[PDB]
Structures are given as structure tokens and as C-alpha cells.
Amino acid sequence: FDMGGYFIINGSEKVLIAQERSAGNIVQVFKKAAPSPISHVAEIRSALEKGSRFISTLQVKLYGRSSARTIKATLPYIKQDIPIVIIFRALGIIPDGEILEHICYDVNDWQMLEMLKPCVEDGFVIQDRETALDFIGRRGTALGIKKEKRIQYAKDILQKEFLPHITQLEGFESRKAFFLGYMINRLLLCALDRKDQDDRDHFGKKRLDLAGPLLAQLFKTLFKKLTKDIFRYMQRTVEEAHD
Amino acid sequence: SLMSCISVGTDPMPIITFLSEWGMEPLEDYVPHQSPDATRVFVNGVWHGVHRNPARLMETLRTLRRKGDINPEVSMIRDIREKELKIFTDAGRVYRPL
Amino acid sequence: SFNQFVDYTLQDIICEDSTLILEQLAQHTTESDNISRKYEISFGKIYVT
Amino acid sequence: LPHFSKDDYSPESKGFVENSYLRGLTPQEFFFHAMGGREGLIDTAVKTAETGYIQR
Amino acid sequence: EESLDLDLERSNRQVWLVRLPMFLAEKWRDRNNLHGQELGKIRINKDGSKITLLLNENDNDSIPHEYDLELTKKVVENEYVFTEQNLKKRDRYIPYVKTIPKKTAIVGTVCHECQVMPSMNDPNYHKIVEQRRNIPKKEILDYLFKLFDEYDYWSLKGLKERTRQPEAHLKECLDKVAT
Amino acid sequence: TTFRFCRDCNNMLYPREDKENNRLLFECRTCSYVEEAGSPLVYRHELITNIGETAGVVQDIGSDPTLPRSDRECPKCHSRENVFFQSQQRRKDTSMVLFFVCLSCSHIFTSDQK
Amino acid sequence: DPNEYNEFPLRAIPKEDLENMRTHLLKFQSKKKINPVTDFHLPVRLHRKDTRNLQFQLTRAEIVQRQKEISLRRKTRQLKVLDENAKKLRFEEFYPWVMEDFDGYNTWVGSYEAGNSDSYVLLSVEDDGSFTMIPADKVYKFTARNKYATLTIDEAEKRMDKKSGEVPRWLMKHLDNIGTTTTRYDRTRRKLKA
Amino acid sequence: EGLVEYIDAEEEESILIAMQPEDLEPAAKRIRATTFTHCEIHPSMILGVAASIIPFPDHNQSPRNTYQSAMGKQAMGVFLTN
Ligand SMILES: [Zn+2]
Ligand SMILES: [Zn+2]
């Protein structure tokens, strides 16, 4: 009768217990409280199964309750939040109507477009992609042959780390742009009160971690430790021999 | 609960190719004006493109997962109110028979 | 969950990071010249008892 | 709860347990009863710690 | 050797773009294929708006022969296809950024894009769907005098390779005269 | 209050004033293209919103099951089948208005009794 | 079907010509139809150049006029491995494709998109009716650049710094009336006139 | 061959369920839509292991069920046969 999925450690029957967490890689909005300068935020967690834990947290923030009407987007490793028109130029969208086509979809409605006009006015500063890519986000490490920032370095950020699902390779900037525009549309719908506030205690937005994934975490960590140790003793066997 | 069960995940990439082959527009030539009402398609969160006639795909995927050619942990939703279509195939979901 | 972790996910987590190379050409000038001493270590199929 | 069509406000859909403990509960009503009891339990489990601190 | 400009006379050519099912793309991107042969036949209406592909039996029935070629885009603008084969061989403008502009050549424009779709009635069609589911003290003394004459900053290591001698004998000789 | 983009380069024209003839020159700022606007209205606020109650009418609402069904008639086609649902614009402040859409005439109609 | 059309099934390319050529795809980004073989001040030099400070870059006519006027080790390291094709792709597209006219009046800058270049395949009718069979390899999207005398980084930073409640509405027009930061075509015209 | 379906926690925002297989299936004891897509297998299988032991659990108070489900794990009997 002992149908049992458990382990025997030191001769005592041990069992795992399923953990849970919020679902990764899924859009949530929020309504942070009034005294904070932020009113609505959007979040994206991400993962990629699961090299160096792949946290890669992203926000899109809104300000004011008027004139503070602005959409600053945070991003690692950029130490300041950025207005989003800079990011659209950085991905390589110049003309503003097509930034708007990325953001909103029904050209007939307008309330979102008057809602976005101040961010466009913020975007009046910079009219070229690398002249947007230049912007600072120092956060280490030491700069190489640069003038202010490598455009190559910034585009390497946007390629490798940023939004580590839909792609990671080299050439999918338009996909990144549409994804960003969809995110903005969701946030803007929440703050424009056509769509209600998200919920966190809906069950489907949770996943149950279990024995396989838990063993995957321990195994990845232990094997990366192992790889570091085997990379040691191979460079420093300068003297004989190849053991 | 008694008939509850846990998803164990399955590679999305046959679903992706299949779903491209039965008619999509990959995002790289999507334009909002010429398709003012076509439906977004998501697979585990990643957008993969837009499609014109959603109902045929939706019933086709139902028939395919009922015929046993897709691992039945896969769950699909056509949120008709917002022109959305989601495919989920990650591990860790909770499901019960019906 | 366990069977999935044993049948797959293990060979996957090995083969995603199998390569490790210290191929030494000279790592300085000369050494006259020298040749590209491929000290490479990589993992293949795994086994379970 | 997923057993009704959308946009109802008839009391059985939103949770009026019309029935009685002698006759037992239809399963939806059983679920709503579970909701109310759970609310009571968690309220007790927080109020006891706070009232103990503030008695000390 | 040649000119540095691109080709232009082949601008006014009609090119057709095909989205292709992936098995058929692999069959048609082969080096042992691509020999001028004609493995199918096309069929446009007099009114247009529907094309089937009359694939010949060279495919040997693993894939279908009746392919509903669906014209995805009737009219296509701002599209130009170009080649590049390799070449025969404030006013401080950088002349050479090592740009190597090879023989670049237009070969036409695109008016139509179409997608190949095998017709489901074929037995090989929809079979592919379940397939997709399936998948010396004095001598060295004089010798030292030439050696530092060759180079005044002569190092010990350079001295040692120029001697191949007992080193303690080598070191006591060096300091007796110079450094 | 809508935006007019520069046709020569897709950027919205900005209000700028003729200093002598006194006209509304919607000028491009990216390039030098200029345009004369139609009305002196430029900016517009709408401090009170009351719109959105009939949102998201897709052409195939009837394909969903979870919408209920009733027996009022479409006062265009008089078919006895129809689909109704709550107002879409979810504020704390909205009403109990029911919007009836019929599958036959594909036509929307409400049941207001003012 | 009766022969109401050029029923020429495909004649494939010369295999010997296939080697040492690569046939990419050009894409333009504008609502108006563009034909460079008509509009452009030929000769056209499609090059792969770095774009760093392309406002102060070279006009071909200006270059011709200027030419006429003048005439310890660490001993230990580790290569975290990367795919050779991906690394070669990084090296190739480390500079993008740029094409201009001879004047530099209108410039277009390409970039690489990796959507579905593999699945596409080319079929052109030739003059004899030959239907040529090219597997397309890559696609490049080109956008026009500096057609309107773009501004620059530093004064841009003084503009975007929060020193003003709003930046000047006609600030770029005022800077153009002052005369700073001219267009590339205007710089070419001034170099031709002088 | 398409008789039962696995349903995750989200498609319930897209489907409609019947209690009984008769509840709306043809068109002094207990007091008890025509677009059903699914019918649940048996409503008693919303319970859990411990709570599946309480006889007539629909006939008392829910917190009493919660107590019993706690206490039952403290009971004693056999546990295995070896
Ligand atoms: Zn303009
Ligand atoms: Zn009617």
C-alpha cells in the first residue's frame, strides 16, 4: 500500500513540499498609493531556465495624479528611469506616428493620444537612434575605448539582457518594440479606467514548483560551482601533469 | 483536490511552427491600419504575431488536442472580448479533468 | 516531476554548458611561435545507475 | 464561480445559501459557506497576536 | 580593379517572393538540387485570385503534389532585391574605414508575395501534421669584451645563453670587470 | 483635438502663430513643412468623462458561450434571439444598463427608460 | 490551364555563379514610393561604414572637390564560448549598410532583421521568361537619416535638462536661423560653391 | 478520442460548467442556460484527502470541517502492513 514518492536520507523518509510563486513572464499592473509620486506601474518578471537565476525585473512607471504626465521606464543596468520615446528610438523607431502605432491601435480614439502628448514632447530632444543609445546608465563596469558610452555597449545591453524572453540573439528589435507598446497600452488602459486593476490572488497566475524544478535549482547551482572548480586546477596545472 | 494534477511542461517550438503554418502574420510586417481588428497570439507570454480569423484556429487546436497530437497539458484561451489568444505550455500549472 | 527531471532536464542542463577550453597558441608573442595547444574538456551523454 | 453565465446578481449566483442544514447544501452554497468560515478563522488568528501585544 | 558603383539596369524586373513550408524549403535549398530542372508547374486563373501548384512526381509522394498557392499580397511596393558577388582583384574625412563594397547588383522589384500551402485532400497532406506531432678564464674574458661591445646593457640571461658555462664561474668573472 | 502629423515626415504638427497675418500655422518641427489649421481650438481637457459603456463590440460576440441569452427582439430584424451584457466601462459610478446585441441583425440596442 | 500565362517552371541559378555571391534584400521605410535609380544623384556607393557622428561625415562630391583642391600578460584566460556563425554575424553587422547619392542629398542606413529570411525564397521572371530560383539569405531594412538637419548630443542635453518648464517651441528653427548644425546636403552645397 | 479534457485554472474564464449530467441537460427533499460546454465529473471531487472522510460534510458548519480535517491526522490505527 506504500505508493509513495519520497526520499530516504540517512534512513529517514523525507518528502518535498510543493512551493508556489507568481507566474513568471506575465503582465501585471498596479495602483500604488496616493502619497507616492507614482500612480500606476506595470511589472514583468522573466526567466530562461535558469542560468544565473535570470531575475531581470522590469518596470514601467507613471507619475502624477495635469503636468507631471510622464512615462519613465526603469531598466537594468540603467541607473535612472528613462522616458520611453528614447527607448523607442533606441530600438530604432524614428517617426512619432509609428511610435504611436506601436503604442495605440485604434487610430480613432484619442484620449490615449492626449495622454501621450507630453511624453512625445519629452522626446523632442533626440532624433536619431544612436543619439538615443548614447544615454548614460553607467552602473559599472569600467569603460573601455569610449567617448561617453559605447553605442555598441548600450545596444549590447538591449540585446543580451533586456527582456530576456522573446529573444536574445541579435535582430528582433521590432518584436521588442511591439512588446513594449503592448505593455504601455495595458498600463495606460489601467490608468485611463477602461480596464480594472489586476488581481494577485487569481490562482492561474501562480505556478507550483515541485520536485523536478527544485532539483533543477540545486543541480544548476552545484554544477556551475563544479565547472568553476574544474576550470581551476586546469589553468594552474602549469607544471605536469594532465591528471 | 482529488483529481487535481500538475503540468510538467512541453517544448513550444512544434506549436509555434504549426501555428505559423496555419496562417499568421509574423510581427515584423504587422501594421495596425491594414489589420484593424486581427487577433494577437501569445505563447507563454511571448507574442509571436497576429492572426486574421481566430475561430478556425481555436477550434482546430481544440480538435488537435482532442485527437492527441498535442500534449493535453497545453491550455488555450480565446479571450474574444480583447482579441487575444494565449497558449501555455510551461510546467507547474494546476489542472483537473472534465 | 521526478521522472521528467531524470529522463530529460539533466542531459539538457549538462549539454547547455558542456564546453570548457584552454586552447593555448602562445598567450604571448614567442615561444617561436608556438602551436595551438587545444586543451579542451567537454561532456557528452550522461549515465545513471 | 464558473457554473453560471456572466453578469448575474440573482442571490443564488452571488451566494445566498437558501437551503438549510437539514437538507444540506448545493455545492456552490457549500463553497460560499467555506469562504465565510475561512474569513472568521484568519481574523481570529491575527487579532489574537495583536491583542496580546497590546495587553502586555 | 573594377568600378565602385552598383548595377542599375536590372531594376525594372519582376521578382516574386514565396513564403514556404519548411520541409519544402529544405527540399529547395539543396546544393545537389538547383540544376535548372522543373519539378512542378504553376496554374493561375484567367481572372487570377487562385493558384494551385501542380508539383510533378519528382517528390516521390512523401510530400503532396497539389499545393494551394495563396497570394498573400497582390501589390507590393518599396521592395528591391539585390545581390553582392565578390570583386575581381572638419574636412578630415577618413578615406578607408575598410569598407569593402563588393559587386552589388539590383536584380528586380517585387509585386507579389505568395504562400505555398499543400491541399489537405492529399494523403501526404495532414500526414505531415501528425509527423509534426511525432517530432677557460681568459677566453671568456675576451669573449665578454666583444659581448658588451655588442650591447652595453647585456643581461645575465643574455650572458648565460651566450656562454653555456658553469654559472658560478660565469658570475665571478662578470663582476671583476663590469656589470 | 486630434493630431495631424507632418506628411513629409511622420511627426505631429505643432501650433505656431503667424506673427502678422494671424493664422494657425501647424508647422512641422522635424522638417520645415507648414500647414494652416482649420479652427482656433487647439487644446482640450475634458475634466469629466462619461463614455465607454459599449466597448469592445467584436463582430462575433455570439461565439462565446458565457454570455447569457434572452428573448427581446431586435428592433431592426425582430429576431427573438439576442445577447445582453453589463456596461463595459467599469467605474464605481456606472449603471445597470443592459446592452442587447442580436446575432441576426448584428445590431446593438439598449433598454433605457428615461 | 491553357497557356494564358508565362508557364515557365523554374530554371535554377548557375551553381558556379552561386559561390562567392550573396543576395540580400532591401527594404525602405516611407509611405511614398521611392525609386533610387531615378531620384538619386548617381553614382551610388553602397558601403558598409561605421555611423559614429555621421552628421560630420563625408560627402562624395565634397571629397572629390577637396581632392581636386589638394592636387604584462596574464598568461591565463578563458574564452566563454560563443557560436561561430553568431560571432561572424556580430562581426559582419558590426557595421551596417549605407548607401547615398553622389551629392549626399539623401542617405539611407540599413540594419539587420532576423525574422524569416530563411523561409523566404526568390522567383524572378527573366527577359526570356526564365524563372530563376534564388534562396534568399538575409533581409535589410533601410531608413532615411539626417534629411532634416538633426541636432546634437550636448546642446540636446542642455535642452532636456530640467532648466525650463518647457523647451522652446521653435528651438530647432531658431538654431537653423542662427546657422549652426546644417544639413549634409547643405554642407555639400556650401563645399561645392566655395 | 475526445471524451474528457484537462482544464487548467484559466479556461474557466472561457467555459461553462454543469453540476449534474442532468441539471439542464433535458430541456420536501432539497431545493436545487442552454450553452453548456463541459460538465463536471462529480461535485464531491472538490474535496481533499482529509475532508473526504467526513460523512455528510454538506450537512454541518464549515469550521467544524476544518477542525476535523486537522484532528484526523492525529488519529491512530494502522499505517502500513510491514
Ligand atoms: Zn516635417
Ligand atoms: Zn434587429
Curated annotation (Swiss-Prot), chain E:
Residue numbers of Phosphoserine PTMs: 3
Cellular compartment(s): Nucleus
Functional summary from the UniProt entry: TFIIF is a general transcription initiation factor that binds to RNA polymerase II. Its functions include the recruitment of RNA polymerase II to the promoter bound DNA-TBP-TFIIB complex, decreasing the affinity of RNA polymerase II for non-specific DNA, allowing for the subsequent recruitment of TFIIE and TFIIH, and facilitating RNA polymerase II elongation.
Family: Belongs to the TFIIF beta subunit family.
Other remarks on this protein: Present with 520 molecules/cell in log phase SD medium.
Subunit structure of this chain's protein: TFIIF is composed of three different subunits: TFG1/RAP74, TFG2/RAP30 and TAF14.
Name recorded for this polypeptide: Transcription initiation factor IIF subunit beta
Native source organism of the sequence: Saccharomyces cerevisiae (strain ATCC 204508 / S288c)
Gene that this sequence comes from: TFG2
Included stretch of the parent chain: 54 to 338 of 400
UniProtKB/Swiss-Prot annotation, chain F:
Keywords on record: DNA damage, DNA repair, DNA-directed RNA polymerase, Metal-binding, Nucleus, Phosphoprotein, Transcription, Zinc, Zinc-finger
Residues modified as Phosphoserine: 39
GO cellular component, one term: nucleus
InterPro entries in the cross-refs: DNA-dir_RNA_pol-M_15_CS (IPR019761), Rpa12/Rpb9/Rpc10/TFS (IPR012164), Zn_ribbon_RPB9 (IPR001529), Zn_ribbon_RPB9_C (IPR034012), Znf_TFIIS (IPR001222)
Zinc finger (C4-type): 6-31
Pfam families tied to this protein: Zn_ribbon_RPB9 (PF02150), Zn_ribbon_TFIIS (PF01096)
PROSITE patterns membership: RNA_POL_M_15KD, ZF_TFIIS_1, ZF_TFIIS_2
Main location: nucleus
Subcellular location as annotated: Nucleus, Nucleolus
Zinc finger (TFIIS-type): 70-110
GO molecular function: DNA-directed RNA polymerase activity; nucleic acid binding; zinc ion binding
Keyword Chloroplast: no
Binding site for Zn(2+) 1: 6, 9, 28, 31
Residues that hold Zn(2+) 2 according to the record: 74, 77, 102, 105
GO biological process, one term: transcription by RNA polymerase II
Summary of subunit composition and partner proteins: Component of the RNA polymerase II (Pol II) complex consisting of 12 subunits.
Note: Present with 2440 molecules/cell in log phase SD medium.
Function: DNA-dependent RNA polymerase catalyzes the transcription of DNA into RNA using the four ribonucleoside triphosphates as substrates. Component of RNA polymerase II which synthesizes mRNA precursors and many functional non-coding RNAs. Pol II is the central component of the basal RNA polymerase II transcription machinery. It is composed of mobile elements that move relative to each other. RPB9 is part of the upper jaw surrounding the central large cleft and thought to grab the incoming DNA template. Involved in the regulation of transcription elongation.
Gene name of this polypeptide: RPB9
Swiss-Prot record, chain G:
Additional free-text comment from the UniProt record: Present with 1920 molecules/cell in log phase SD medium.
Protein localization: Nucleus
PTM comment: Phosphorylated on Ser and other residues by TAF1 and casein kinase II-like kinases.
Assembly: TFIIF is composed of three different subunits: TFG1/RAP74, TFG2/RAP30 and TAF14.
Residues included from the entire protein: 94 to 447 of 735
Family: Belongs to the TFIIF alpha subunit family.
Top-level taxon of origin: Eukaryota
Record function comment: TFIIF is a general transcription initiation factor that binds to RNA polymerase II. Its functions include the recruitment of RNA polymerase II to the promoter bound DNA-TBP-TFIIB complex, decreasing the affinity of RNA polymerase II for non-specific DNA, allowing for the subsequent recruitment of TFIIE and TFIIH, and facilitating RNA polymerase II elongation.
Protein name, entry field: Transcription initiation factor IIF subunit alpha
From Swiss-Prot, chain H:
Compartment(s) of residence: Nucleus
Family per similarity comment: Belongs to the RNA polymerase beta chain family.
Something else known: The binding of ribonucleoside triphosphate to the RNA polymerase II transcribing complex probably involves a two-step mechanism. The initial binding seems to occur at the entry (E) site and involves a magnesium ion coordinated by three conserved aspartate residues of the two largest RNA Pol II subunits.
Subunit description: Component of the RNA polymerase II (Pol II) complex consisting of 12 subunits.
Function text: DNA-dependent RNA polymerase catalyzes the transcription of DNA into RNA using the four ribonucleoside triphosphates as substrates. Second largest component of RNA polymerases II which synthesizes mRNA precursors and many functional non-coding RNAs. Proposed to contribute to the polymerase catalytic activity and forms the polymerase active center together with the largest subunit. Pol II is the central component of the basal RNA polymerase II transcription machinery.
UniProt protein name: DNA-directed RNA polymerase II subunit RPB2
Annotated organism of origin: Saccharomyces cerevisiae (strain ATCC 204508 / S288c)
Coverage span on the entire protein: 687 to 784 of 1224
